[PDB]
A and B are shown apart, each in its own frame.
Chain A
Amino acid sequence: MLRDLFDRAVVLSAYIHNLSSEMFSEFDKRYTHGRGFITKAINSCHTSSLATPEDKEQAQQMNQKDFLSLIVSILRSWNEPLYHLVTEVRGMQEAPEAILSKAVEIEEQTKRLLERMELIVSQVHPETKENEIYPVWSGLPSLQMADEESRLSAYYNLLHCLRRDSHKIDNYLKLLKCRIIHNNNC
């Protein structure tokens, strides 16, 4: 049942972006509003290197099998940093509670989304070569550095990138739902 799968997937993705947006805003206003952390955020996301559509026309040009697999790569690439974000934050004695709760929820919801996505692909494209090639995040030393300013800035960029990527995953899932289920007559 494609329609129930897509519907649940889109619920999770739009909710993950919500939580990520709110986490970043609470981090920003509370830890970094006091400097050019925005200037440091430029070009620094681990999924930058992927070939992602940047406008509607590019999205329409993508074949659907590659588009689904793209969403799946992006989500598989976030497994690692979300794990470390939760682990690191949870292990502080004075952990920002509102921030920690969103991160834990995103970490869990991201797993549920990925399961949905895997179901969707095996329903729509049963043949797909199972072969992971998603980009590696390797930013843990910066999240761990003792220098507070470098540390807060590594957190800033991670959260800024998560807010971006969740928004992009949500939007691409919405394009695909409309394409596959409604022949683009949503």
Chain B
Amino acid sequence: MLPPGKPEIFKCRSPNKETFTCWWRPGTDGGLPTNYSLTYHREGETLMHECPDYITGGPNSCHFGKQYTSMWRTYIMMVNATNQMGSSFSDELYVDVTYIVQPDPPLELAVEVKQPEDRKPYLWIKWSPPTLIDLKTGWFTLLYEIRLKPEKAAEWEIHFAGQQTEFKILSLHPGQKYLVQVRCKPDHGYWSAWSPATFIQIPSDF
């Protein structure tokens, strides 16, 4: 017997500046929606468009493939929540793909102990970028940070690796096991989630 309450587009994110996805939530305190429709227009155009893909982003999401995504151009979007008693519209949300970039975590974090003759020994960390980022053309630029700590230590040691995909750490405590994680951000944008940890035992003879 109630129309939907007022829905909210609460987040958008682009993982690679080539596609993006936005997510909404239904308002509490109205009735159950039976449909949502996300519409938008773009700065400098009058054409109104519907969300091009309601499936890929899962529940209550709009995903914009490559053919609907461009940088440097505001999207003005709105979602409505409808049922047989009526309808409710979100606030318009102003989004620029340029400012919502957050990559997925780096992949294949691997770690090794290296003990060279009379050069300082070291921990060798290596990893790869998330898939579907285009670094090779210079479209996308990725910066990385490593953190590592033994269990029960109160602080992580953080090392900024800039754009390298490998790094060397000196003077770890001999005999201690370390948890190592890597994360990445665009040149301009948000840090990814930390990768899952890799574990490494630093040998006694270090």
Contact surface of A with B, Cβ cutoff 8 Å:
14, 17-18, 21, 38-39, 41-43, 48, 52, 54-56, 59-60, 164, 167-168, 170-171, 174-179, 182, 184-186
Contact = CB atoms under 8 A, between A and B. Distances in A.
Interface string B83-100: 000000000001010100
5 contacts: A17-B188, A55-B18, A171-B71, A182-B136, A184-B137
Interface of B: 17-18, 43-44, 66, 69-74, 76, 94, 96, 98, 134-139, 141, 187-188
Q: What does DSSP make chain B's interface, helix, strand, loop or mixed? A: loop
Contacts of A38: 94
A141 B98 CA distance: 30
B43 A177 contact: no
Contacts of A56: 17-18, 134, 137, 139
B137 A55 contact: no
Contacts of A18: 188
B72 A168 contact: yes
A60 B17 CA distance: 15
A98 B66 CA distance: 38
Given A167-B98, A185-B136, A55 B44 contact: no
A14 B134 CA distance: 18
A68 B74 CA distance: 25
